[PDB]
């Protein structure tokens, strides 16, 4: 009754916590008078990447730091010089954030045993994905199919990439597929394609914690922070939420 499950990438099967991007931002400011925390790097949710770099420029404290190092406030020339460098570094460190999130390759092991096809979508461009897919593959993870915002007319809020997975995998009543993701947009994409949509919490971007940070942290503070992310997913489309991929099989059963 459920022939396919389509997974998201970073924050769902690869790059726990989703740090690759934050790493580049921190790097770029570091090469000069950095002083930037990964907490500041997650705030920027502007439209374009350049807008992100600009946002950090604007951020008081960071601005002040730049001034104490250069005796001047950041310039358009400066913003332009840094952004220009973002993509170079990104390609350089992606291989380091392409390892299965653990529990993953094991459920993908199953599911595939009981005849379920596995597809996927992403916000990453085709280029980026060639690199990521190869490292991830050469490490225990490789989906039956893959689609990017380049292979269709639009980005992710839209269902175009999901319909592609459908055709290529040969599964059709859309409600015979499940969408799993780590962010609010993942929920929307799924609801827009008429699929059962499930959101994962531990390891998501919505959570923001590191594999290591979660390890520690006050057990009562975690269960509070998890409860917040779960509420956001639901309020945005999720049909079901789960803490680790290891509850997926169970959810399927429920659906039937």
Q: Residue 104's closest CA among 128, 139, 132, 156?
A: 139
C-alpha distances out from residue 142 to 75, 122, 135, 188, 206, Å = 43, 14, 10, 25, 24
Q: What is the signed CA dihedral for 85, 91, 96, 98, rounded to 10 degrees?
A: 130
The β-bridge partners of 100 are: 14
Task: For residue 175, state whether it binds a copy of itself (rule: CB under 8 A).
Answer: yes
Q: Which residue has the tokens 């079901």?
A: 240
Residue 173: name its binding partner from Mg ion, a copy of itself, none (Cβ under 5 to 8 Å by kind): a copy of itself
Q: If contact means CB under 5 to 8 A according to the sort of partner, which of a copy of itself, Mg ion, none does residue 10 touch? A: Mg ion
Q: How many residues bind Mg ion (CB under 5 A)?
A: 4
Residue from the set 4, 10, 41, 200 that interacts with Mg ion by CB under 5 A: 10
Cβ proximity to a copy of itself: between 17 and 159 the closer is 159
Q: Helices (DSSP H) in the chain: which residue ranges?
A: 20-30, 49-58, 62-70, 76-93, 104-109, 126-137, 160-169, 184-192, 211-215, 219-234, 248-255
Kindly state the smallest distance separating residue 6's Cβ from a copy of itself, in Å. Answer: 14
Give φ, ψ of 209 to 5 degrees. Answer: -90, 160
CB 8, min distance to Mg ion, A: 5
Q: Give the per-residue contact string, 158-187, with Mg ion (x = CB under 5 A; - = no).
A: ------------------------x-----
User: How are beta strands 117-120 and 177-181 bridged, if at all?
Assistant: unpaired
- The option from a copy of itself, Mg ion, none interacting with 21 (CB < 5 to 8 A, set by class) reads none
Identify the residue whose tokens are 């060639």. Answer: 130
> Which range of residues in 31-39, 82-90, 96-104, 146-154 is near a copy of itself by CB under 8 A?
146-154
Which one of Mg ion, a copy of itself, none is in contact with 168 (Cβ closer than 5 to 8 A by kind)?
a copy of itself
Among candidates 189, 194, 197, 180, which has minimal Cα distance to 244?
180
Q: How far is the CB of 165 from a copy of itself (least distance, A)?
A: 11
Is residue 222 within the footprint of a copy of itself (CB under 8 A)?
no
Phi-psi region of 152 (alpha: psi -120 to 50; beta: other; left: phi over 0): beta
Question: In terms of CB distance, is 11 or 181 closer to a copy of itself?
Answer: 181
Q: Is 44 helix (H, G, I), strand (E, B) or coil?
A: coil
Which one of 95, 123, 194, 208 is in contact with a copy of itself (CB under 8 A)?
194
Q: How far apart are CA 64 and CA 77, in angstroms?
A: 18
DSSP annotation of 17 reads T
Choice from 2, 7, 11, 21 touching Mg ion (CB under 5 A) = 11
Instruction: Identify which of residues 10 and 108 has a Cβ nearer to Mg ion in the complex.
Output: 10
Binding mask 155-174 for a copy of itself (x = CB under 8 A): ---xxx--x--xxx-x-xxx
Contact residues: a copy of itself, CB under 8 A: 152-154, 158-160, 163, 166-168, 170, 172-175, 192-194
């Amino acid at each position: 009754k459920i022939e396919a499950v389509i997974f998201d990438w970073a924050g769902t099967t690869v790059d726990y916590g989703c740090f690759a991007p934050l790493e580049v931002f921190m790097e770029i400011f570091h090469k000069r008078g950095v002083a930037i925390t990964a907490e500041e790097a997650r705030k920027p949710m502007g439209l374009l990447r350049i807008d992100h770099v600009r946002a950090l420029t604007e951020m008081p404290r960071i601005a002040s730091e730049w001034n104490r190092v250069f005796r001047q406030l950041p310039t358009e020339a400066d913003i332009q010089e840094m952004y220009e460098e973002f993509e170079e570094i990104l390609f350089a460190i992606l291989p380091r954030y392409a390892s299965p999130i653990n529990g993953v390759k094991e459920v993908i092991a199953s599911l595939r045993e009981r005849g379920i096809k596995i597809g996927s979508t992403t916000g990453y461009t085709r280029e980026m994905m060639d690199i990521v897919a190869k490292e991830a593959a050469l490490q225990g993870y490789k989906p039956d199919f893959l689609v990017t915002p380049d292979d269709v007319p639009a980005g992710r809020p839209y269902p175009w990439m999901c319909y592609k997975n459908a055709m290529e995998l040969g599964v059709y009543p859309m409600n015979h597929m499940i969408k799993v993701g780590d962010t609010v947009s993942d929920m929307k994409e799924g609801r827009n394609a008429g699929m059962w949509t499930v959101g994962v919490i531990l390891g998501s971007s919505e959570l923001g914690l590191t594999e290591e940070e979660v390890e520690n942290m006050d057990s009562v503070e975690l269960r509070e922070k998890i409860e917040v992310v779960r509420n956001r997913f639901v309020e945005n489309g999720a049909h079901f939420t789960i803490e680790t991929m290891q509850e997926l099989e169970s959810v399927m059963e429920h659906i039937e």
